[PDB]
Coordinates of all heavy atoms in Angstrom, one line a residue:
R5 N 1.6 -4.2 14.5 CA 2.8 -4.1 13.7 C 3.5 -5.5 13.3 O 3.6 -5.7 12.1 CB 3.9 -3.2 14.3 CG 5.1 -3.2 13.5 CD 6.1 -2.3 14.2 NE 6.5 -2.8 15.5 CZ 7.6 -3.5 15.7 NH1 8.3 -3.9 14.7 NH2 7.9 -3.8 17.0
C6 N 3.8 -6.3 14.3 CA 4.5 -7.6 13.9 C 3.6 -8.6 13.1 O 4.0 -9.3 12.2 CB 5.3 -8.2 15.1 SG 6.7 -7.1 15.5
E7 N 2.3 -8.5 13.5 CA 1.3 -9.3 12.9 C 1.3 -9.0 11.4 O 1.2 -9.9 10.5 CB -0.1 -8.9 13.5 CG -1.3 -9.6 12.7 CD -2.6 -9.1 13.3 OE1 -2.9 -8.1 13.8 OE2 -3.4 -10.1 13.0
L8 N 1.3 -7.7 11.1 CA 1.4 -7.2 9.7 C 2.7 -7.6 9.1 O 2.7 -8.1 7.9 CB 1.1 -5.7 9.6 CG 1.0 -5.2 8.1 CD1 -0.1 -5.8 7.3 CD2 0.9 -3.7 8.1
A9 N 3.8 -7.3 9.8 CA 5.1 -7.7 9.2 C 5.1 -9.2 8.8 O 5.6 -9.5 7.7 CB 6.3 -7.3 10.1
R10 N 4.6 -10.1 9.6 CA 4.6 -11.5 9.3 C 3.6 -11.8 8.2 O 3.8 -12.7 7.4 CB 4.2 -12.4 10.5 CG 5.4 -12.4 11.6 CD 5.0 -13.5 12.5 NE 3.9 -13.1 13.4 CZ 4.1 -12.2 14.4 NH1 5.4 -11.7 14.4 NH2 3.2 -11.8 15.2
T11 N 2.4 -11.1 8.2 CA 1.5 -11.4 7.1 C 2.1 -10.9 5.8 O 1.9 -11.6 4.8 CB 0.1 -10.7 7.3 OG1 -0.2 -11.0 8.7 CG2 -1.0 -11.0 6.3
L12 N 2.7 -9.8 5.8 CA 3.3 -9.3 4.5 C 4.4 -10.2 4.0 O 4.6 -10.4 2.8 CB 3.8 -7.8 4.6 CG 2.7 -6.7 4.8 CD1 3.4 -5.4 5.0 CD2 1.8 -6.6 3.6
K13 N 5.2 -10.8 4.9 CA 6.3 -11.7 4.6 C 5.8 -13.0 4.0 O 6.3 -13.4 2.9 CB 7.1 -12.1 5.9 CG 8.2 -13.1 5.5 CD 9.6 -12.5 5.4 CE 10.7 -13.4 5.1 NZ 10.7 -14.6 6.1
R14 N 4.7 -13.6 4.6 CA 4.1 -14.8 4.0 C 3.5 -14.6 2.6 O 3.6 -15.5 1.8 CB 3.0 -15.1 5.0 CG 2.8 -16.5 5.4 CD 2.2 -16.5 6.8 NE 0.9 -15.8 6.8 CZ 0.4 -15.1 7.8 NH1 1.2 -14.9 8.9 NH2 -0.8 -14.5 7.8
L15 N 3.0 -13.4 2.3 CA 2.4 -13.1 1.0 C 3.4 -12.7 -0.1 O 3.0 -12.4 -1.2 CB 1.3 -12.0 1.2 CG 0.1 -12.3 2.1 CD1 -0.7 -11.1 2.3 CD2 -0.7 -13.4 1.5
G16 N 4.7 -12.8 0.2 CA 5.7 -12.5 -0.8 C 6.0 -11.1 -1.0 O 6.5 -10.8 -2.2
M17 N 5.9 -10.2 -0.1 CA 6.3 -8.8 -0.3 C 7.7 -8.4 -0.1 O 8.2 -7.4 -0.6 CB 5.4 -7.9 0.6 CG 4.0 -8.0 0.1 SD 3.9 -6.9 -1.4 CE 3.2 -5.4 -0.6
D18 N 8.4 -9.2 0.8 CA 9.8 -8.9 1.1 C 10.6 -9.0 -0.2 O 10.7 -10.1 -0.8 CB 10.3 -9.8 2.2 CG 11.7 -9.4 2.6 OD1 12.2 -8.3 2.3 OD2 12.3 -10.3 3.3
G19 N 11.1 -7.9 -0.6 CA 12.0 -7.8 -1.8 C 11.2 -7.7 -3.0 O 12.0 -7.7 -4.1
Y20 N 9.9 -7.7 -3.0 CA 9.1 -7.6 -4.2 C 9.5 -6.4 -5.0 O 9.4 -5.3 -4.5 CB 7.6 -7.4 -4.0 CG 6.8 -7.7 -5.3 CD1 6.5 -9.0 -5.8 CD2 6.4 -6.6 -6.2 CE1 5.9 -9.3 -6.9 CE2 5.8 -6.9 -7.4 CZ 5.5 -8.2 -7.8 OH 4.8 -8.4 -8.9
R21 N 10.0 -6.7 -6.2 CA 10.5 -5.6 -7.1 C 11.6 -4.8 -6.4 O 11.7 -3.6 -6.6 CB 9.4 -4.6 -7.5 CG 8.7 -5.1 -8.8 CD 9.7 -5.1 -9.9 NE 9.1 -5.7 -11.1 CZ 8.6 -5.0 -12.1 NH1 8.6 -3.6 -12.0 NH2 8.2 -5.6 -13.2
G22 N 12.4 -5.5 -5.6 CA 13.5 -4.9 -4.9 C 13.1 -4.0 -3.8 O 13.9 -3.2 -3.2
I23 N 11.8 -4.1 -3.4 CA 11.2 -3.2 -2.3 C 11.3 -4.0 -1.0 O 10.7 -5.2 -1.0 CB 9.8 -2.7 -2.7 CG1 9.7 -1.9 -3.9 CG2 9.2 -1.9 -1.5 CD1 8.3 -1.3 -4.3
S24 N 12.0 -3.4 0.0 CA 12.1 -4.2 1.3 C 10.8 -4.2 2.1 O 9.9 -3.3 1.9 CB 13.2 -3.6 2.1 OG 12.8 -2.4 2.7
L25 N 10.8 -5.2 3.0 CA 9.6 -5.4 3.9 C 9.5 -4.2 4.8 O 8.3 -3.8 5.0 CB 9.8 -6.7 4.7 CG 8.6 -7.1 5.5 CD1 7.5 -7.5 4.5 CD2 8.9 -8.4 6.3
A26 N 10.6 -3.6 5.2 CA 10.6 -2.4 6.1 C 9.9 -1.2 5.4 O 9.2 -0.4 6.0 CB 11.9 -2.1 6.7
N27 N 10.1 -1.1 4.1 CA 9.6 -0.1 3.2 C 8.1 -0.3 3.0 O 7.3 0.7 3.0 CB 10.4 0.0 1.9 CG 11.5 1.0 2.1 OD1 11.3 2.1 2.5 ND2 12.7 0.5 1.9
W28 N 7.7 -1.5 2.8 CA 6.2 -1.8 2.7 C 5.5 -1.5 4.0 O 4.4 -1.0 4.1 CB 6.0 -3.2 2.3 CG 6.3 -3.6 0.9 CD1 7.2 -4.5 0.4 CD2 5.6 -3.1 -0.3 NE1 7.1 -4.6 -1.0 CE2 6.1 -3.8 -1.4 CE3 4.5 -2.2 -0.5 CZ2 5.7 -3.5 -2.7 CZ3 4.1 -2.0 -1.8 CH2 4.6 -2.6 -2.9
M29 N 6.2 -1.8 5.1 CA 5.6 -1.5 6.5 C 5.5 0.0 6.7 O 4.5 0.5 7.3 CB 6.5 -2.1 7.6 CG 6.5 -3.6 7.6 SD 4.9 -4.1 8.3 CE 4.7 -3.4 9.9
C30 N 6.6 0.7 6.3 CA 6.6 2.2 6.5 C 5.5 2.8 5.7 O 4.8 3.7 6.3 CB 8.0 2.7 6.2 SG 8.1 4.6 6.6
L31 N 5.3 2.4 4.5 CA 4.2 2.8 3.6 C 2.8 2.6 4.3 O 2.0 3.6 4.5 CB 4.2 2.1 2.3 CG 3.1 2.6 1.4 CD1 3.6 3.7 0.5 CD2 2.5 1.5 0.5
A32 N 2.5 1.4 4.7 CA 1.2 1.1 5.3 C 1.0 1.9 6.5 O -0.1 2.4 6.9 CB 1.1 -0.4 5.5
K33 N 2.1 2.1 7.3 CA 2.0 2.8 8.5 C 1.6 4.3 8.3 O 0.6 4.7 8.9 CB 3.4 2.7 9.2 CG 3.6 3.7 10.4 CD 2.7 3.4 11.5 CE 3.1 4.3 12.7 NZ 3.6 5.6 12.2
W34 N 2.2 5.0 7.4 CA 1.9 6.4 7.1 C 0.7 6.6 6.2 O 0.1 7.7 6.4 CB 3.1 7.1 6.5 CG 4.2 7.1 7.6 CD1 5.4 6.5 7.6 CD2 4.0 7.7 8.9 NE1 6.0 6.6 8.8 CE2 5.2 7.3 9.6 CE3 3.0 8.4 9.5 CZ2 5.3 7.7 10.9 CZ3 3.2 8.8 10.8 CH2 4.3 8.4 11.5
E35 N 0.4 5.7 5.4 CA -0.8 5.8 4.5 C -2.1 5.5 5.3 O -3.0 6.3 5.1 CB -0.7 4.8 3.4 CG 0.3 5.0 2.3 CD 0.2 6.3 1.6 OE1 -1.0 6.8 1.6 OE2 1.1 6.9 1.0
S36 N -2.1 4.4 6.1 CA -3.4 4.1 6.8 C -3.3 3.8 8.3 O -4.4 3.5 8.9 CB -3.8 2.8 6.1 OG -3.2 1.6 6.4
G37 N -2.1 3.8 8.9 CA -2.0 3.5 10.3 C -2.4 2.0 10.5 O -3.0 1.7 11.5
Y38 N -2.1 1.2 9.5 CA -2.4 -0.2 9.4 C -3.9 -0.6 9.5 O -4.2 -1.7 10.0 CB -1.6 -1.0 10.5 CG -0.2 -0.7 10.7 CD1 0.3 -0.7 12.0 CD2 0.7 -0.6 9.6 CE1 1.7 -0.4 12.2 CE2 2.1 -0.4 9.8 CZ 2.6 -0.3 11.1 OH 4.0 -0.1 11.3
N39 N -4.7 0.2 9.0 CA -6.2 0.1 9.1 C -6.7 -0.3 7.7 O -6.5 0.5 6.7 CB -6.9 1.4 9.6 CG -8.4 1.3 9.8 OD1 -9.1 0.5 9.3 ND2 -8.9 2.1 10.7
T40 N -7.4 -1.4 7.6 CA -7.9 -1.9 6.3 C -9.1 -1.0 5.8 O -9.2 -0.9 4.6 CB -8.2 -3.4 6.4 OG1 -9.3 -3.5 7.4 CG2 -7.1 -4.3 6.8
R41 N -9.8 -0.5 6.7 CA -11.0 0.3 6.3 C -10.8 1.7 5.9 O -11.7 2.4 5.5 CB -12.0 0.2 7.5 CG -12.4 -1.1 8.0 CD -13.2 -1.9 7.1 NE -13.9 -3.0 7.8 CZ -14.9 -2.9 8.7 NH1 -15.4 -1.8 9.1 NH2 -15.4 -4.1 9.2
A42 N -9.6 2.2 6.1 CA -9.2 3.6 5.8 C -9.5 4.0 4.3 O -9.2 3.2 3.4 CB -7.7 3.7 5.8
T43 N -10.1 5.1 4.2 CA -10.5 5.6 2.8 C -10.1 7.1 2.9 O -10.2 7.7 4.0 CB -12.0 5.4 2.4 OG1 -12.8 6.0 3.4 CG2 -12.4 4.0 2.2
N44 N -9.8 7.7 1.8 CA -9.4 9.1 1.6 C -9.8 9.6 0.3 O -9.3 9.0 -0.8 CB -7.9 9.2 1.7 CG -7.4 10.5 1.3 OD1 -7.8 11.5 2.0 ND2 -6.8 10.6 0.1
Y45 N -10.7 10.6 0.3 CA -11.2 11.2 -0.9 C -10.2 12.3 -1.4 O -9.8 13.2 -0.6 CB -12.6 11.8 -0.6 CG -13.0 12.6 -1.8 CD1 -13.4 12.0 -3.0 CD2 -13.1 14.0 -1.8 CE1 -13.9 12.6 -4.1 CE2 -13.6 14.7 -2.9 CZ -14.0 14.0 -4.1 OH -14.4 14.6 -5.2
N46 N -9.9 12.3 -2.7 CA -9.0 13.3 -3.3 C -9.9 14.4 -4.1 O -10.2 14.1 -5.3 CB -8.0 12.6 -4.2 CG -7.2 11.5 -3.4 OD1 -6.7 11.9 -2.4 ND2 -7.2 10.3 -3.9
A47 N -10.2 15.4 -3.4 CA -11.0 16.5 -4.0 C -10.4 17.1 -5.3 O -11.1 17.4 -6.2 CB -11.2 17.6 -3.0
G48 N -9.1 17.1 -5.2 CA -8.3 17.5 -6.3 C -8.7 16.8 -7.6 O -9.0 17.5 -8.6
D49 N -8.6 15.4 -7.6 CA -8.9 14.8 -8.9 C -10.1 13.8 -8.9 O -10.2 12.8 -9.7 CB -7.6 14.2 -9.4 CG -7.3 12.9 -8.7 OD1 -7.2 12.9 -7.5 OD2 -7.3 11.8 -9.4
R50 N -11.1 14.1 -8.0 CA -12.3 13.3 -7.8 C -12.0 11.8 -7.8 O -12.6 11.1 -8.6 CB -13.4 13.8 -8.8 CG -13.5 15.3 -9.0 CD -14.8 15.9 -9.0 NE -15.9 15.3 -9.7 CZ -16.6 14.1 -9.4 NH1 -16.2 13.4 -8.3 NH2 -17.5 13.6 -10.2
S51 N -11.1 11.4 -6.9 CA -10.8 10.0 -6.7 C -10.6 9.6 -5.3 O -10.5 10.5 -4.4 CB -9.5 9.7 -7.5 OG -8.4 10.3 -6.8
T52 N -10.7 8.3 -5.0 CA -10.6 7.8 -3.6 C -9.5 6.8 -3.5 O -9.3 6.0 -4.4 CB -12.1 7.1 -3.4 OG1 -13.0 8.1 -3.9 CG2 -12.3 6.7 -1.9
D53 N -8.8 6.8 -2.4 CA -7.8 5.9 -2.0 C -8.4 4.9 -0.9 O -9.1 5.3 0.0 CB -6.6 6.5 -1.3 CG -6.1 7.6 -2.3 OD1 -5.9 7.3 -3.5 OD2 -5.9 8.7 -1.7

Side-chain angles (χ1 to χ4, degrees):
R5 178 184 62 97
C6 293
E7 171 182 28
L8 182 65
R10 290 191 288 284
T11 311
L12 293 178
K13 178 103 177 306
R14 225 152 60 213
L15 302 172
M17 292 284 264
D18 186 19
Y20 192 80
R21 273 296 173 98
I23 300 181
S24 82
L25 191 64
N27 271 304
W28 282 120
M29 288 290 302
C30 185
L31 181 93
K33 166 67 171 35
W34 296 114
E35 289 301 334
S36 78
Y38 311 141
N39 187 335
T40 63
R41 308 288 196 69
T43 56
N44 169 65
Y45 174 70
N46 303 308
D49 80 299
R50 316 229 313 73
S51 69
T52 316
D53 306 312

